[PDB]
Amino acid sequence: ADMTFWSWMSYLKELPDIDESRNPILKRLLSGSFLRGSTTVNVRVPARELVRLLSLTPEQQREGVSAKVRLINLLDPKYSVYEPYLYREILPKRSPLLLPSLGEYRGAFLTYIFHPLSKGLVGDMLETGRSHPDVQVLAANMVAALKSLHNLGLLHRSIELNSFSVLPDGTVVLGGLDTAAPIRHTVKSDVYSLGVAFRNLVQLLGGAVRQDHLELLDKLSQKMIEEEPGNRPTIEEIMKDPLFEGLNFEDIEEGKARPFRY
């Protein structure tokens, strides 16, 4: 649902405070020019005050956290609170294949979203050759993740390989949800974008990497990037592609896939 200026401003005020004097994020931002969309700050070793604010388990403490920060714009509050709004009001507390929030806060001039500190973005990881995943399972993980967003009535609208990230436990999740919007952009434009990401994946990978999986993914991606939306398969048709036969999609959707284990 699309709100009004006063709604967004009101919602901004409803976000809980964070204490910025007790917090190295501001210091890091002032020690450079980092602040642009959003800016990401990694906190590999959260301090006591941040551990308390987020109620981090010892496991979470060891994983680290990342903060997504945006400058509050008083002429357009939507830009700074849209993503917090999605996390608080629209997305389930834990959809298994979507990037989880650990908390949303407002300071004097910034909004904050905390995330688990990811092991990396999928595009970057494959590009550096750091990881050789099971192509079949990764592709299925990616389709499933998108489907889980469509089931909530949301398009992503900016899918790329780096939309996907690998959590410390090895779960691959869909992030970059600040561009998400209700179901011009349609389900078929998300199919196109995911197709382009698959093409990107095949170009990068031409351990668990199998040549027959790559050829099948290339064929699937060619269907997904058809110029005419009507000629592109639905998510349902994609899930019945030859590439995914023998896979239990229910397990993928529950978040049990680990495409980057050998």
**DSSP collapsed to 3 states, the chain:** CCCCHHHHHHHHHHCCECCHHHCHHHHHHHCCCCCCCCEEEEECCCCHHHHHHHCCCHHHHHHCEEEEEEECCCCCCHHHHHHHHHHHHHCCCCCCCECCCCEEEECCCEEEEEEECCCEEHHHHHHCCCCCCCHHHHHHHHHHHHHHHHCCCEECCCCCHHHEEECCCCCEEECCHHHCEECCCCHHHHHHHHHHHHHHHHHHHCCCCCHHHHHHHHHHHHHHCCCCHHHCCCHHHHHCCHHHCCCCHHHHHHCCCCCCCC
Rounded to whole angstroms, the Cα distance separating 51 from 113 reads 14
**Neighbour-count burial of 115, counting CB atoms closer than 10 A to its CB (0-12 exposed, 13-18 middle, 19+ buried):** buried
Chain CA centroid to CA 38, Å: 14
- Strand pairing category for 181-182 and 154-155: antiparallel
Q: What are phi and psi of 65, to 5 degrees?
A: -130, 160
Question: Residue 115: CB partners within 8 Å, gap ≥ 6?
Answer: 65, 66, 67, 68, 99, 100, 101, 102, 175
Q: What are phi and psi of 175, to 5 degrees?
A: -120, -155
Rounded to whole angstroms, the Cα distance separating 172 from 141 reads 7
Q: How many CB atoms lie within 10 A of CB 26?
A: 17
Structure determination technique employed: X-ray
- Dihedral of the CA atoms 118, 124, 128, 133 (nearest 10)? 70
Q: State both tokens at 17.
A: 């405070």
* Nearest residue to 259 via CA among 134, 163, 77: 134
Beta bridge mates, 111: 70, 106
Q: How many CB atoms lie within 10 A of CB 127?
A: 13
Rounded to whole angstroms, the Cα distance separating 115 from 40 reads 10
Contact 120, 40 (CB under 8 A): no
Contact 85, 161 (CB under 8 A): no
Rounded to whole angstroms, the Cα distance separating 116 from 94 reads 13
* Nearest residue to 217 via CA among 179, 168, 152, 161: 161
Chain CA centroid to CA 243, Å: 24
Question: Residue 163: CB partners within 8 Å, gap ≥ 6?
Answer: 156, 174, 175, 176, 197
Task: Say how many Å lie between the first and final Cα of the chain, rounded.
Answer: 43
Q: Where are the domains of the chain?
A: 1-262
Contact 196, 223 (CB under 8 A): no
Residues preceding discontinuities in the chain at C–N > 2.5 Å?
Answer: 36, 183, 206
**Neighbour-count burial of 70, counting CB atoms closer than 10 A to its CB (0-12 exposed, 13-18 middle, 19+ buried):** buried
Contact 122, 172 (CB under 8 A): yes
